[PDB]
């Protein structure tokens, strides 16, 4: 009969924060990006549409507080180009303009946009006064686009082409409503989630691609949103924050979140050899750290699948990829493969590996520097998610 009519958010997009001025120990300080008396359009895919949707802005890692001078949304119309009649103020408490302390997120009022499903909006800021913005998504691997002056409501955005950026700026979640029954699968993970060497601008990340299979079989009411960090490890900070401390606010208070796909520990294992010699740690640590992520996820009735580490043997030998990496890859997959405790294994290992030799990446998913998949390495871990564990 009729589908009760009380309405609820759901993530459609998401993207984790990072500090951008954070540094691995012993490395030179990093600077932040700074805005001054300009705007930023970034372009985002929506996998739930809906009625009405929420703006979550962010100064997670900023220092001292930023001033969203104006926000809004519209329907993108490719690169920097929106639907003028679609464009709309967003508002925080009736406010245009809100503070952010440091440390600190906020979700928008509602807007009234009706939107669809893998349609691509724009969220447009300006910044009147000089603003540092370390919380970012750093890999965006999307166009954004900075002018000059408050630009929001424009058409295009009127800039020079070096004014452009791959990252995401202190925007950080895009909830859509619906009175819908209604699934939202979180991709957790570091840049084989975050989609690191699939398209720019072409919605090929490893969720776009699982996004397109739930709708092209008809379930347009399950969502998934990617919480990847490119370079992200489960026990040390850098690169973003440590999987086990984000795991509450990019995985459990994820707006609506019914399932979640953990794939995180590779980098863990290939930071060890240069990257950071302090900061080894075996797969007993790895699994430590996952099995009470898992533990918190399944008491919020979460339904947790964890993927095994894909093979990466050829990546940077001897300064990430080593002998060591691979025995503590091989216990963490075994752990995985054997696991009571988790809802079920994805075995991107075994969908990715190369049949002439298990321990690399089949050379036709392999993005040339034999950890990163490309396009069709991200489709095929798709491929290899059985739908039905995400009804
Ligand atoms: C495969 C891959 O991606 O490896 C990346 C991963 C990072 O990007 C993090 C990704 O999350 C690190 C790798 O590039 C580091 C280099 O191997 C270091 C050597 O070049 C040092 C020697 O040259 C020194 C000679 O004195
Ligand atoms: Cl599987």
Do not use: C
């Not at 990072?18 to 300009?38: E, H, Y």
């Not at 809906?50 to 890692?61: A, H, Y």
């Not at 302090?278 to 430590?288: G, L, S």
């Amino acid at each position: 009969g009729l589908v009760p009519r009380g309405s609820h958010m759901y993530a459609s997009w998401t993207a984790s924060m990072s500090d951008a001025t954070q540094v691995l120990p012993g490395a030179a300080p990093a600077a932040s990006q700074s805005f001054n008396n300009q705007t930023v359009r970034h372009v985002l895919r929506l996998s739930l549409g809906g009625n009405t949707l929420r703006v979550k802005v962010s100064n997670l890692f900023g220092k001292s507080p930023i001033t969203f001078t104006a926000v809004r949304v519209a329907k993108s119309t490719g690169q920097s180009n929106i639907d003028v009649s679609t464009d709309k103020s967003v508002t925080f408490n009736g406010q245009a303009s809100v503070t952010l302390e440091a440390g600190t997120e906020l979700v928008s009022d509602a807007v009234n946009l009706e939107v669809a499903p893998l349609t691509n909006i724009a969220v447009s800021m300006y910044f009147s006064s000089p603003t540092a913005m370390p919380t970012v998504h750093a890999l965006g691997v999307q166009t954004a686009f900075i002018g000059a002056g408050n630009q929001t409501a424009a058409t295009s955005i009127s800039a020079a082409a070096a004014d452009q950026s791959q990252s995401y700026y202190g925007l950080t979640a895009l909830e859509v409503s619906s009175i819908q029954k209604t699934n939202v699968v979180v991709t957790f993970g570091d840049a084989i989630t975050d989609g690191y060497k699939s398209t720019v601008d072409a919605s090929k990340r490893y969720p776009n691609q699982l996004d397109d299979r739930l709708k092209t079989a008809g379930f347009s009411r399950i969502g998934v949103v990617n919480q990847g960090i490119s370079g992200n490890r489960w026990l040390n900070d850098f690169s973003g924050p440590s999987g086990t401390s984000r795991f509450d606010r990019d995985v459990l208070n994820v707006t609506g979140i019914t399932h979640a796909i953990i794939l995180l520990g590779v980098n863990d294992l290939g930071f060890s050899a240069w990257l950071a010699p302090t900061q080894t740690v075996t797969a007993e640590q790895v699994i430590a750290a996952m099995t009470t992520a898992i533990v918190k996820a399944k008491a919020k009735g979460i339904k947790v699948f964890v993927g095994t580490i894909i093979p990466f043997k050829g990546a940077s030998m001897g300064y990430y990829y080593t002998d060591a990496a691979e025995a503590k890859r091989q216990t963490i997959n075994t752990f995985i493969r054997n696991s009571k405790e988790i809802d079920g294994v994805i075995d991107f290992a075994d969908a990715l590996k190369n049949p002439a030799d298990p321990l690399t990446i089949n050379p036709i998913y392999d993005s040339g520097d034999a950890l990163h998949p490309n396009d069709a390495g991200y489709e095929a871990m798709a491929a290899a998610i059985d739908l039905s564990k995400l009804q």
